[PDB]
Amino acid sequence: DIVMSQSPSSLAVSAGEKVTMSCKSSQSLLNSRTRKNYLAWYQQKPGQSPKLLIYWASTRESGVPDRFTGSGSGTDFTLTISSVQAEDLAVYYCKQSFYLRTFGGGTKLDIKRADAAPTVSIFPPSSEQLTSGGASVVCFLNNFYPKDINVRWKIDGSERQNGVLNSWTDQDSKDSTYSMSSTLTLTKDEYERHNSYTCEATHKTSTSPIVKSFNRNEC
Amino acid sequence: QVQLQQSGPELVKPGTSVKMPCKASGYIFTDYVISWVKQRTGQGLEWIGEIFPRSGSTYYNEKFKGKATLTADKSSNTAYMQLSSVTSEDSAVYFCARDYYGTSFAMDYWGQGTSVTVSSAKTTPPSVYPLAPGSAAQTNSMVTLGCLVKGYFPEPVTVTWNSGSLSSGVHTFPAVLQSDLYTLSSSVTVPSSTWPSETVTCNVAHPASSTKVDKKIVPRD
Ligand SMILES: OC[C@H]1O[C@H](O[C@H]2O[C@H](CO)[C@@H](O)[C@H](O)[C@H]2O)[C@H](O)[C@@H](O)[C@@H]1O
Numbered sequence: 001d002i003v004m005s006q007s008p009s010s011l012a013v014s015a016g017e018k019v020t021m022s023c024k025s026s027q028s029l030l031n032s033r034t035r036k037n038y039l040a041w042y043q044q045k046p047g048q049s050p051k052l053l054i055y056w057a058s059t060r061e062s063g064v065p066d067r068f069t070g071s072g073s074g075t076d077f078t079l080t081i082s083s084v085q086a087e088d089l090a091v092y093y094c095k096q097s098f099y100l101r102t103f104g105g106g107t108k109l110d111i112k113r114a115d116a117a118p119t120v121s122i123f124p125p126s127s128e129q130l131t132s133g134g135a136s137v138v139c140f141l142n143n144f145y146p147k148d149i150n151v152r153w154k155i156d157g158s159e160r161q162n163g164v165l166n167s168w169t170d171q172d173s174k175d176s177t178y179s180m181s182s183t184l185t186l187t188k189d190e191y192e193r194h195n196s197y198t199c200e201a202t203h204k205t206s207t208s209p210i211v212k213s214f215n216r217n218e219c
Numbered sequence: 220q221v222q223l224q225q226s227g228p229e230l231v232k233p234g235t236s237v238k239m240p241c242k243a244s245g246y247i248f249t250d251y252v253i254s255w256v257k258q259r260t261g262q263g264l265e266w267i268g269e270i271f272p273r274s275g276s277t278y279y280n281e282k283f284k285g286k287a288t289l290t291a292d293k294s295s296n297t298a299y300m301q302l303s304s305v306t307s308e309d310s311a312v313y314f315c316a317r318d319y320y321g322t323s324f325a326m327d328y329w330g331q332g333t334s335v336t337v338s339s340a341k342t343t344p345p346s347v348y349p350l351a352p353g354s355a356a357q358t359n360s361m362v363t364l365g366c367l368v369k370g371y372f373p374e375p376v377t378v379t380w381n382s383g384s385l386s387s388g389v390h391t392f393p394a395v396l397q398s399d400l401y402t403l404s405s406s407v408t409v410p411s412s413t414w415p416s417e418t419v420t421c422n423v424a425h426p427a428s429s430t431k432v433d434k435k436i437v438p439r440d
């Protein structure tokens with residue numbers, strides 16, 4: 001059986017730069033009678049099926065923009081993207097079809113861009129939720145770069161650790177930023193016993209946190 | 220047009236078998252191989268096996284030899300994958316793919332994938348909650364609204380805004396599992412002058428429960 005290795009596991013480039021990524025096979029993929037290497041490259045964007053880019057190591061699939069090139073032979077192969085676009089955000093896999101099929105581990109491509117501060121929004125529990133007996137407060141930290149960010153929650157001025165779940169988006173092709181949601185869930189009875197809820201965002205773009213608050217009797 | 224139509228999400232109990240279809244249309248079915256590929260959440264593609272539908276001949280990744288059985292019904296242009304004695308290790312998305320063996324030796328058209336979850340848990344549909352800001356208007360050139368989709372199982376759920384006609388400014392967050400239920404959220408950002416005047420609705424689908432919910436976002440008082 002054939003074993004496939006890709007490197008690096010990820011890499012970051014700025015829009016318009018060139019990137020090359022590498023694939024190795026445990027056995028040659030060069031065919032005897034043929035002059036072809038049975039090696040294909042695939043692009044998989046978040047939430048989508050893989051898409052064929054190149055086959056026979058170097059033939060481009062129809063519709064594939066000409067910025068994607070494949071090269072190499074035997075046990076050593078390369079995929080090159082000239083002038084990366086933010087729409088190229090994806091995992092890239094090589095795959096042998098010399099005997100059966102084997103995918104490489106993938107190379108994740110990330111985009112580098114200018115730092116941007118988060119836009120921070122806080123939201124109280126809905127009255128729908130409250131009739132359920134539970135109560136989520138949600139904070140969106142949107143359209144920021146780089147990815148590293150800290151969020152802190154306070155109730156009536158006091159920090160809070162349990163019941164806070166966080167989730168980051170994939171890097172956006174539209175503007176190369178990240179976003180983050182933070183949800184604090186409490187029981188309805190604990191939520192009503194307290195009056196003020198605050199979410200604080202610490203990002204490298206500014207030395208002081210961005211702070212959003214709401215009060216249960218604000219109107 | 221070439222299409223490979225896979226079944227929707229499958230919640231199955233540990234120890235049982237699951238059999239999933241891949242219905243091919245738009246080309247000569249017996250001229251291409253059907254390959255099957257596994258992908259765990261956030262992980263890489265892993266090839267399972269293939270069937271040559273003309274002959275019925277099958278080849279498997281040895282790791283899957285005891286797990287998978289590939290078949291093909293030539294009369295219905297449908298390839299099937301059966302997974303036996305399922306465990307949590309089998310929880311994944313399975314793709315089928317048209318595989319041009321003998322020519323490109325590449326997988327040129329792919330199914331959308333069938334999400335298999337192996338669990339004893341029951342199917343629970345989501346509750347969908349509107350996210351509208353409290354009285355204090357905050358930074359009021361654009362306004363951010365959202366939907367909280369709480370308490371469902373299994374994955375996946377999808378979210379759109381105004382049936383997909385509200386596209387830009389959207390952020391849909393990955394689901395997190397907590398105490399046996401998933402939660403996710405989605406935000407949308409619009410000009411403050413357009414809302415509440417022009418409606419904003421999130422449209423939530425949960426295919427495992429065959430449920431769809433629309434939640435219009437309306438201002439609080
Ligand atoms: O990672 C490249 C993809 O970026 C966009 O999608 C991500 O960014 C969105 C906005 O924050 C999120 O809602 C989404 O969940 C992320 O996957 C873009 O929409 C995709 O088309 C890109 O392939």
Ligand SMILES: OC[C@H]1O[C@H](O[C@H]2O[C@H](CO)[C@@H](O)[C@H](O)[C@H]2O)[C@H](O)[C@@H](O)[C@@H]1O
Nearest residue numbers: 003004103104105106259262263264265
């Ligand atoms: O040879 C590399 C490893 O291959 C297998 O991994 C497959 O499945 C992983 C997660 O299930 C993917 O992330 C990976 O890309 C695939 O190769 C498996 O991990 C082992 O058999 C091998 O060490």
Ligand SMILES: OC[C@H]1O[C@H](O[C@H]2O[C@H](CO)[C@@H](O)[C@H](O)[C@H]2O)[C@H](O)[C@@H](O)[C@@H]1O
Nearest residue numbers: 049050220221222223328329330331332
């Ligand atoms: O019917 C429109 C097209 O549907 C398929 O393509 C879509 O769905 C595939 C599976 O999710 C994707 O890989 C593809 O990128 C989508 O556009 C079909 O394969 C096409 O031939 C149809 O034109």
